[PDB]
Structures are given as structure tokens and as C-alpha cells.
Amino acid sequence: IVEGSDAEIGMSPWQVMLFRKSPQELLCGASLISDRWVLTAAHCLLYPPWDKNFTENDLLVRIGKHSRTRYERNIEKISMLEKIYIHPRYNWRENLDRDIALMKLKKPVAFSDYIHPVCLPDRETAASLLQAGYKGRVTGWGNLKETGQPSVLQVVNLPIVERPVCKDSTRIRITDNMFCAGYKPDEGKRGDACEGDSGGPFVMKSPFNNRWYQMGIVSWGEGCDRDGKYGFYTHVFRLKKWIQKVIDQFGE
């Protein structure tokens, strides 16, 4: 996260780290959506232009963390993956359309003060909150600058941008399965996701029922925190029929 700040303890208890087993390293973010299911970006798991294709046994998920590098004894939990599910229409060749994946854990994780799932939006949630100017929150342990790494989880709040402005910022074809967020040059405030933040959540707190909803997944951007560029996020509600199909077919 560029131009963010340190998270408070327990501020994002659905935050998940994806951790490469060997070499031991941060791969991406993710989010806890139930005791057995973790949501991330497909490009964190499958991206052929970089010879990335992870299988279940290549990875671990770390839940409940605050420190980036510490083993947080008696706080974090480390879970093994049973199975990865990537959206069958994930478009890695062109623009990362449908950049979404699910990971089923081998065993359920116990909730705690530090480990708790986020809600997924329904149609009305999305209609009420996904509006230009409304702010959401992005969290992660990715880099602090485009060209180091944080001691603790970072957080930044960012406004959703008008679709024609998002489209006019890039040569990439923007689909209805994406939205963008970030400040405009003239707004003077700053912030963005950066390398290592991908797969993490973009959340909003409903003012109607006081709950946090994951509206987006950190998907892609053109550099980090560049003036006139925006971050792009997978539109979770637009892909919920797939989410539910997978959990309904394979959950226990």
C-alpha cells in the first residue's frame, strides 16, 4: 500500500496472507469469507505470462496477522489448502477480466478477536454503495512504493471513480466486472495498492446495517499511486453467482 497508514489491531480480521512455502515469501493478499473459504484474485494463482501456476500444495494461508514478517504466536493461524477454484472465464490473456478465485481450507479456522469473516454483497448492497465518490478501504502488506516493505499491515481509504474517468485513464478495455478507485490529481490526496497487495479486499461499511462488505478484490493497476492512474478491482457482486455455485457444489 502506497501512502497508507498502519492498521489498528483487529481492524481487518478477514485479511489473509498468501504465503509461498519455498522460498518462504509473501505472494498476495486474500480475504476470509467463512471458516473454510478464502477469496483472492485469480492472477495470484494463475498467470501464464509469468509462468505462475500454483497448485494447492505450493501455498499456505496465514490468518489473523498484523506483522508482515513475524510468526505471531498465539494470534495468527496457518491453514493448508484443500483445493483452488479459478473462475472458468478468467481472462489472463487480455485484461484480467473476472480476476477471482476461491480457496477451500483443509480444516476450518477458529474465529477469534483477530480472525473473523467479511460479508459478501447482495444486489442491493452493490446498488447502494458502488457509486462514484463513495469510499472503500484497501489493506495489504505489499510494497510502500513502486520502486520498501511494511513492518505491519497497511490501510488506505479510496473513492470509487466514475466509469468514464477510469476508462479514459488506460488503454486497457474495462469491463463491467471491474471498477476503479483512487484520488484524482486535483484532489491532492493519495494512495494505492502496490506489488504484494493483489488479491486483497476492497471493503465498505454499510451505513444501513453497520457491517463490512467486500465489494472489490485488488486486481491491477499501471504502476502504483501514479497521478492520473487508478487501481482496478474485481467487482465481487457481479461474480457472486460463480462464488455461490462453487460453495454450493463443494462446501461441506
Binding site: 481492524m11 473473523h116 469473516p117 460479508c119 465518490g133 463513495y134 453497520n210 463490512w212
Partner: peptide, 28 residues
């Protein structure tokens, strides 16, 4: 049933340092 309600915040009626910024943006 309890999704999205944080043990150290909503389920103690404590606010985090910047959630009000989000609320203030949900104007209309």
C-alpha cells in the same frame, strides 16, 4: 450471521480511526 462485525470494533461499539471518513463519503 455475524459476518462483517469485528470483535474489536463493532462488537464492542468501538470505532476505528478512519471509518468515519467512509461514512462521510456515503452522502447520497
Amino acid at each position: 450471521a455475524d459476518c462483517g462485525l469485528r470483535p474489536l470494533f463493532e462488537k464492542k461499539s468501538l470505532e476505528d480511526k478512519t471509518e468515519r471518513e467512509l461514512l462521510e463519503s456515503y452522502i447520497d
